[PDB]
Amino acid sequence: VRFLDGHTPAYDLTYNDVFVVPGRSDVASRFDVDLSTVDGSGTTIPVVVANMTAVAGRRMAETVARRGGIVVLPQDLPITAVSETVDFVKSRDLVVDTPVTLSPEDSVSDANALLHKRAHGAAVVVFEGRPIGLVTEANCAGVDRFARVRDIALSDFVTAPVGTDPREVFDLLEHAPIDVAVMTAPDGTLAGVLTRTGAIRAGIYTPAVDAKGRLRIAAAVGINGDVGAKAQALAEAGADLLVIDTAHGHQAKMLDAIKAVASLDLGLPLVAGNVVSAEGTRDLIEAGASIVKVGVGPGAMCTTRMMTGVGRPQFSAVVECAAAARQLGGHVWADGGVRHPRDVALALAAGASNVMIGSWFAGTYESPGDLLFDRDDRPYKESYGMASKRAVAARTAGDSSFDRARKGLFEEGISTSRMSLDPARGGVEDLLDHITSGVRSTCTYVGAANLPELHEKVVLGVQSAAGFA
Amino acid sequence: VRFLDGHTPAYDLTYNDVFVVPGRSDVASRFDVDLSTVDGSGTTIPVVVANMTAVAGRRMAETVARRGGIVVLPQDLPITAVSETVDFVKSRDLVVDTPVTLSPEDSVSDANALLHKRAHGAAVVVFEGRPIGLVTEANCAGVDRFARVRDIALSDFVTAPVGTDPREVFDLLEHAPIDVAVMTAPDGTLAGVLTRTGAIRAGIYTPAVDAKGRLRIAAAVGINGDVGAKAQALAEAGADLLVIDTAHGHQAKMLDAIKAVASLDLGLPLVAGNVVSAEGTRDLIEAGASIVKVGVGPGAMCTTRMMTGVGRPQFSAVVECAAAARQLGGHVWADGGVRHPRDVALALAAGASNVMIGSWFAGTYESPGDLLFDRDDRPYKESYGMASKRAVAARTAGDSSFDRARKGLFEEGISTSRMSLDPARGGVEDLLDHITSGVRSTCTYVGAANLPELHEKVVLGVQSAAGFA
């Protein structure tokens, strides 16, 4: 990277210590920017969803893959569930989205409960596969709670055949009382749903698909047990990418696991982490890892940094690791708690081929968690970090309660967090457009048409903390 | 600029990182300081009002031009409205101000609504052009709301002929129950209003006027459409200064627009922006720009800096750009959210020929926005940034709703802000005197009689952030 003259700080830098200096630009608008990645992951946007049980679900996988991103499933999920989710996701359409199907005999409470797990704002009543009507919020609200769907269902809705142009769909929905555009198969049965905003996004984003034209998906594995067997089983289950993640990625056990997985030669790229040092990056790459995650205790007040004085500011660590990987011909991923689009922009500018997003996406409809209401009725969802205590207890296999409690004594608390959900941008795409708009604005400011040029022609500067007063 | 020995920070500086060291002074008082500008803008004070729809109105133009400043009209205004406003402003008096004229049959609510858009605190009732009386607050307040002006108008007021000395006017108003000094033409008809504070200010400030003795005015243009045609039309409409502003001023489209406007050779100075780099400043100047605006994402927590890691601390950017412009024989303007007179003082000390003020002036009577009352009855006015979403939608010309929504998807929210209005200093001049007093005190402390000397003989220093605890 390039810094302004005289800017040679005597400390590692974080995202608050740096800024991008505008340069000569030839890009007209944001839409003239290509966000495709070159790390081999096949993502059309530099966004990866973290393998967190409260985040990495199936609806996230569908939506993110439809919008060009990728999702990594949690490592603790059973192989059968993994295969089921992979089959479900690869069976989804690239243009229309799977809506919520409700029986006419279902209750109002269950109706709204299944309604609030999608961002469409409506649910389709299905009888033998044919839509009869739509149920929305404020339609099941304010009514007697013992009523059923048939007593509140609205039979009037817009209908279109498969293959209809999204522009035509939006034009039809220009005056529609309800923005929903339920999609019907040529036989007549339900074949997905579409939305005017979704129709617009269909012309902006490009879904990430494999050689078969099906949405890509990634899975995570540990370093305990037969790593090779689990990796091969996941690959046979349909997984496209393999992730090996742990708190400390420079330990020899990570090297052994990477060598074991690389020996099988599954023919898929490997993501390994986490390390924050160039030496660790070199060791991981030489061990057989094509992608290296970066970021350990990135915050100055994070749980890891408070518990132990171990960590590193995200920016400098990412810069060094990316430099090492490019020297060795690899790629790096930027983990470490992304909270603003500025974080993504700086990660891209530092040399990271992709960015990893965790708890931020927890407060969304598509998240596996259920939506709850707080003291002030404001929606929120609980978060449990990397995994819950019950989850880690399940990974400890069949062990004596004495040994289990002995191991859990040193273990910290669940540290559950109440991630509020923004009403204006509650949808997952309502965050993806936000982040991508930030990144595209950055690219226009720099004057780069794609991410490699963004890394090539970026000039950075440093500011003190007195500007934060 | 000159810094104390040993002060060579390893980071860019902002306004909180620097201070001015007092030096040998020969200036007796604040009044012995000349604030005239040398950038060619013709302003007698280093204040420029930003081209914001919620700020750049007509009353601001009149008051600011009467006090020596300049105002730039928004670029989205129709040409007819621009010409009308230019004619109205150039038809105003250089000593007296245009009051609010109320019909005797008007209602109390409308009376106070038209009363609260000026700082005089009174409105003149007009019948065939002759004053009959004055209506003030607490005069229409506490009365029956269906009453009319004639039922509350006070026919007793002070009257003077045109040409009366301001000192005489103040002496007459020494014992006046109402400080208003409504001004009558020699025929007898209304010819403006005067105020004791305004009379005092008439001897302090110098209105900015053109070769014809009429108040100067500036206009802004974009880089979309026929830039040359719009610039020439605005010049023919009576505009004195042309401003070309955009988020990123170093892009080639800015260069093309500047070249196109300079080819016509309208004979007026050009203001171009925004850039924060010396290279961008050189490119803009060589392209045909006489004045360069500075400041992109100046705040460490501003919307631009949060969305993208793009920006620069205001002080260092201004210093570098001013150095480049002086090397090339140009001038720079200091944009970037001025909030305290310290900001203006440091901008002047850094080498900026003028300072640009935006949202701060929103909370004023003279602002185009209407005054509102909050939950605690405290007055406030809404702000919409550079422009409102409806405004930008209007600039997108005639486009399909599909394309309009597609372009607006990436667009952020309106981000309206409630700018409170200070009761003690609610008037625009009540902020101009504040800022000018700060600047004059700075000049006295340094020991400079005018801005060029202020830039020449200023010595600065650097402080850490621990002083902010």
Add this chain to the structure above:
Amino acid sequence: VRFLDGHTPAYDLTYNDVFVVPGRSDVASRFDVDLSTVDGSGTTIPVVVANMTAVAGRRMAETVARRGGIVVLPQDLPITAVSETVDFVKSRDLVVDTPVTLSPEDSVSDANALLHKRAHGAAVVVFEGRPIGLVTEANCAGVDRFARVRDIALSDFVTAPVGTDPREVFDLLEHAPIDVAVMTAPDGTLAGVLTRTGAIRAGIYTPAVDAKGRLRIAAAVGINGDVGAKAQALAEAGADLLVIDTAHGHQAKMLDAIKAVASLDLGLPLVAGNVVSAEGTRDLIEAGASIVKVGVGPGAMCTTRMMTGVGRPQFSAVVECAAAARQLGGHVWADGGVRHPRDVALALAAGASNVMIGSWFAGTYESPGDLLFDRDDRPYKESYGMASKRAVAARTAGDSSFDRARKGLFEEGISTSRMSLDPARGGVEDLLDHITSGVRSTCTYVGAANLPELHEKVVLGVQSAAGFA
């Protein structure tokens, strides 16, 4: 001064940026430290009270001079009042303090009002000069408000002759129900009051007196009018020290005033200010000033620094000015808003011969202001900065209201502040002991028996702002 190896900061330092490293010490206890000053002011402690109308009163003068300090009267006081106060103070005793004298016919409200202007907590009823009894708080409280002193006066009190040893007085008051020790002249009439804490302090502090054994006192003058005439009149009035103070002390008018006063050769030391530069210090000393005040806009968020970017961190300015004065054989005084004893300690360590204390002493019983009660009944006193607006209006002499308002337009607000009074340490001595204890502890830590050694053998260090998180 001496700094640790490698500590060469690239910025000016303030009190939060430095610390004192302990060294080899031979001092046994705090009492083994001599706090006498060598600047020629004659103060036995390095404390000077600022010339603020809300602070520099007569009770402060008496108490502070009895405790070894000095007080400078405000420059706006009439010469007759100055002479009266000087005569009153020089007529006071060096061991006992003047109590509050109340007539037996006075009302309860007036009784407590005159009671709460002294820290003794009691008032002596006087009839023809002989005490009859004492009235205290909770004695006039809870009673009918129309009652009088004679109905609540307590005739039982301790009495001693003049010349009694303070140790004997304390021993007698060991079991006294009321700690007051009203003092009687050999004739029988009242000759002062004494307190057990005051008796203890009599053996610790040394009152500052002139060649005649009377308490010393200082006065302040401006630079407007006949400076020499006012200075000579004040000297004839009995003033011991002369202070010439203004916002900017490096202006030529200060030089002319200093030369004019020095020409008369009144035979008293001169205090001049304020400057923060070595050049200004040299100019003031060569002009005929023996003591130079330091400190202009010392706070990073003070009114002066917000209004203008003019100022300097207190520590570095004091260091440089003290170095210059010692090079020229002079002395410096440390002004600039002392708030903690750490401030005094660092001022002494930097090389300052004395320290100037302002608003901190406002919240005290001895302050000229009257004690008020807030919303939460917590006592407080108002402060008006250097002087009130009415005061500065009075200094503008006989001028036309037009000119007066013209000059006051640029003048800022009164900026009155509510200085809370600490119930535990409400007395002035309750702050002097605090500050002196801090200074003595510093001296013991360094290992110096007096202030010159404290300046000679002090080693300092620098810390970052991250320790303030």
Add this chain to the structure above:
Amino acid sequence: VRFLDGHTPAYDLTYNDVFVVPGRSDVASRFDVDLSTVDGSGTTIPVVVANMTAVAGRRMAETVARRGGIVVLPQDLPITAVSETVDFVKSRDLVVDTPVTLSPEDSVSDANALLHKRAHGAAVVVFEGRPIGLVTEANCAGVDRFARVRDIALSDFVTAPVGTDPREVFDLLEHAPIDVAVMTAPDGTLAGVLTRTGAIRAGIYTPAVDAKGRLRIAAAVGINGDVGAKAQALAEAGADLLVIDTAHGHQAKMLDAIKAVASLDLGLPLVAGNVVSAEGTRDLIEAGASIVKVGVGPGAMCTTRMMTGVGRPQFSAVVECAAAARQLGGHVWADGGVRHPRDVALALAAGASNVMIGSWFAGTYESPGDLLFDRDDRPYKESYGMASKRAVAARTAGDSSFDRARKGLFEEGISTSRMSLDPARGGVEDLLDHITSGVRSTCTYVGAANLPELHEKVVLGVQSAAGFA
């Protein structure tokens, strides 16, 4: 120590300015780390409890010595009490803990009062030395307050013989309704209590014992009076370690006291303090001190730093002192208000052989203070700093009230603090496991099997304060 390239700050560093960079690691788990100390103190963990009257009790001594730490008794305790406490502690078991013994005739209020001074949550009723039953909270709660133990005692409890394996004890208590495991001597009488968590900890920690297999204990002495006589008497009383502590440890009186104690040659290591300078450390070591305490006014807002500008950031002072001691072949201890395990980790990394913990342990059951309930029923305990005012008054021996008050005038307030007690981790071991887990995680991250390697192969870095926004 080793710092990253280019990190040469121009200021002293504190714990917030530094971080540990992860390195190559071979340690498998936390349990593979040896925490034994090499300073000669005999502690198996790097934890020392401060000699504070509100902290250094007898229950702390027992628990901490059982868990491998050491405790220093306050210097003001009478010699008889010291000998009694030493005998009591050395008479305790190394595996089981002494429970609370309650008479059956005691009242409910007294029952719970004696119950809440231990972390077991139960009390054993004793008749002639044989248990009859257990009384717990919520068992004496909600009952009539005049009832007695016999009316609420639960006679059903688990019983085991002495010598039973802790693993067997836990296995038996796997299904026990009450986790208490009251321990019976082979005769049948009470011989201690055990807990499942305590049983687990018995296999993790190693109690610190002397050559006789009895728990070690330390005592503190002053520099007033016959230091040698008191030191010899304490050594004869059974004390294992001697501590000489004062506010300023570089004074000559400390040197004389150290020489006097070393002349007797009691054959025990000497702890001396406090100093923060290398010169002071060298002087103390040459005077006959084997261990040097570090830390004077470590906080930027502590009472010492506010009273006097004397102090030093803890990290840099510890680094320098440890370097000096290692150069001279000694050891250092890290005092200065430890509040988080990060503090301990950085102290160990800097080169400190041990860490000293003060007020943090005040909010614990084992603390000598009694548990109180606040306004919100939340438990808390008062703290009085190093010692209470009554305590220091008692150390002033037999002195006249006049002299006592004279000395106490300069003395500051008691500064009592309400240390809240965490319900989840209210036990002392519930903090020891926390701290040790943090330290072990640090060791694993660095890749060191013991503290000397932790100091040897640690690499540190520096961060700015802008990360704290």
